[PDB]
Every structure is written in structure tokens, then in C-alpha cells.
């Protein structure tokens, strides 16, 4: 067909315009960079021209960022069977998460500058209830995997990078005084829904690429659609990274809290559940070995599977290290 088929200039104008539109957005709009998070949170963190009366009331008026966080805490504390997807909360959580990190022998004194700037940049958020908000959204999701809980985990990590002591203390205080079991029940359900390597799915993927089928409006060659083996690998990674950051810095107060909940009516052993996921992962890897035992060379997709599976095993082992260090 390709030697004889229709050139570009013979297409209908409207169809050609449609191709131009999708090509333009994929090549010039998605590729475009626009860093607006810093100038968003900068504006939202100013309460100006309200100090003329210099009133002494403790609450004063919350600045716009605090009001926004209070609103999202309110919609997370409301009683609802299922957590609906709020596209604006997903956008504001992503904006807040991207507005903290902002990221060859660096001198130890100037090394201390970027960290001590990061602590301030986190302190712009966690002093305004974002730490409690993250815990509430985690408890509210009831263990239902999705981009809603994923953006909450990403925000929690963005405010927990470097093992912030204040954030870990505020989070421990909120869980200890609230004494609710929804948080650890949702964490346990989330961890039990994490996926492992699947040989049957991999073989289906291999045969699917064996077909190499093509579409009609032009042609895509070797399409890069969603992989069906360890699709949620990124979500499992930053779930354990969130758990690791919680125990980072040898926080023995919270390390005992994960193992057992004194205040709560029901105790959930996160350490044991982490082990049980680790076993499910190594079972997958061990059963992935025997498929390549006969073969001598490991192909590209099998490489990319091992790369993501081992990166997940790394995050699990680091979390298990943090659970016991201190000791």
C-alpha cells in the first residue's frame, strides 16, 4: 500500500486539519513548559491590607491558601459512601505538590541552603493544615485506587521530603487524638490491591506486539499504549516512599504507631502487611525467572519489567529498613 497510497496533499481539508490539530497539540502544547505554581502559592499565601485595625483575635482571617485547604478538608470530612473525583482538587493537589520540591561538589554550607529553603517552602503549606488534609483524603478514599489517592500521596511526599520533623509530629498528633481506624484500613486495602508481575499478562502483551496492528487515520508504528504488567508500579513506589518518609529520621514515636495503635479500637500491622506484599512481589519475580530459565537472552520488554520490578523492590526494602532503624 505505502508505495501507491494517498499522499498528504490529496486528503480532504477537514480531515487534514484534524491531523494537524492533534499533531500540533502533541508536538507544541504538551511539550511546552509553564511554571506557574510558585507564583500561585506566592499570591495565595499573602493576607495584605487587613492589619489596619490590628485586632488581637487569635483566628484573624485565614489567608486564601488556608481557606482553600479548609474547603478541601471539609469536602473530605463530609460523610459520603464513595469519594468522587474532584478535578480541581486533583489540579490544586498537583500544583501544591509541584510547588515544594522545585527540583559537582556542592559545599556543605551551600548544601544547607537548598534544604533550609525547602523546609520553609514546605512550611508554607503544612502550617496551613495540608498535613491533616492529606491524612483525611487517605482515610476518605476507603482503599479505592485511583488518581485521586495518587495525587494525595504525591502531595504528602512533597510535604514530607527530607523527613520533616514538624510534619511527622503533626501527622502523629492528628492520628493519635482523632483515634480513627479509617486511615490504616484504607492503607492496608491500598497495599493489598497493589499488583505484581503477571506471566499470563506478559505473554498476552508479547502476542499483542506480535500482531503489531495499525490504525486507519494515518498509522502508528509500535504504539506505546499502557502496559498491562505493573501498570500501578509508580503508585506502589510512591505509596512505599510515603510510608518510608513517615518513619524517616528515626522517629521511634511513629515507628511503634505503625506496628500497633494504642488509642484505636482495632490494630493493623503495617509491617506484616508490607512483608506480605514483599512475598507477593518475590513470588512474581521467582516465577518470572523460570520463564526465562530456558531462554538465554532477555528481550527489551522483559528488561523494562525487571527494571520496574526491582525499583519497586528497592522502595520496599528501603521502607523495611526505615521501619527498624534506630532501632
Amino acid at each position: 500500500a505505502c508505495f501507491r497510497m494517498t499522499p498528504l496533499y490529496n486528503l480532504p481539508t477537514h480531515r487534514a486539519c484534524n491531523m494537524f490539530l492533534e499533531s500540533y497539540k502533541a508536538a507544541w502544547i504538551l511539550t511546552e513548559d509553564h511554571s506557574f505554581e510558585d507564583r500561585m502559592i506566592d499570591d495565595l499565601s499573602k493576607a495584605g491590607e487587613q492589619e489596619e485595625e490590628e485586632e488581637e483575635v487569635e483566628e484573624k482571617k485565614p489567608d486564601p491558601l488556608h481557606q482553600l485547604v479548609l474547603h478541601f478538608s471539609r469536602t473530605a470530612l463530609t460523610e459520603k459512601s464513595k469519594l468522587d473525583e474532584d478535578y480541581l482538587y486533583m489540579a490544586y493537589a498537583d500544583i501544591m505538590a509541584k510547588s515544594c520540591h522545585l527540583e559537582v561538589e556542592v559545599s556543605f554550607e551551600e548544601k544547607e541552603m537548598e534544604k533550609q529553603r525547602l523546609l520553609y517552602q514546605q512550611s508554607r503549606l503544612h502550617t496551613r493544615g495540608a498535613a491533616e488534609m492529606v491524612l483525611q483524603m487517605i482515610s476518605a478514599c476507603k482503599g479505592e485506587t485511583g488518581a485521586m489517592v495518587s495525587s494525595t500521596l504525591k502531595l504528602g511526599i512533597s510535604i514530607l521530603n527530607g523527613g520533616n520533623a514538624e510534619v511527622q509530629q503533626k501527622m502523629l498528633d492528628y492520628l493519635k487524638d482523632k483515634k480513627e481506624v479509617g486511615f490504616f484500613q484504607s492503607i492496608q486495602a491500598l497495599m493489598q490491591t497493589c499488583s505484581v508481575l503477571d506471566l499470563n499478562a506478559f505473554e498476552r502483551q508479547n502476542k499483542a506486539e506480535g500482531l503489531g496492528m495499525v490504525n486507519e487515520d494515518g498509522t502508528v508504528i509500535n504504539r506505546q499504549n499502557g502496559e498491562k504488567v505493573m501498570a500501578d508500579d509508580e503508585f506502589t513506589q510512591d505509596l512505599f516512599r510515603f510510608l518510608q518518609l513517615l518513619c524517616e529520621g528515626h522517629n521511634n514515636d511513629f515507628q511503634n504507631y505503625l506496628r500497633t495503635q494504642t488509642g484505636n479500637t482495632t490494630t493493623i500491622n503495617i509491617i506484616i502487611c508490607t512483608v506480605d506484599y514483599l512475598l507477593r512481589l518475590q513470588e512474581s519475580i521467582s516465577d518470572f525467572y523460570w520463564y526465562y530459565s530456558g531462554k538465554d537472552v532477555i528481550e527489551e520488554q522483559g528488561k523494562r519489567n525487571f527494571s520496574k520490578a526491582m525499583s519497586v523492590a528497592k522502595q520496599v526494602f528501603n521502607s523495611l529498613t526505615e521501619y527498624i532503624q534506630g532501632p
Partner: peptide, 14 residues
């Protein structure tokens, strides 16, 4: 280009 279907022709053009 002329032996490739149009979608990626615009992709490489742009």
C-alpha cells in the same frame, strides 16, 4: 514522507 501515512508526515513536518 510520501511512502509514510499522513499522520506522521505532519508529525515530522511540525
Amino acid at each position: 514522507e510520501f511512502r509514510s501515512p499522513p499522520q506522521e508526515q505532519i508529525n515530522m513536518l511540525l
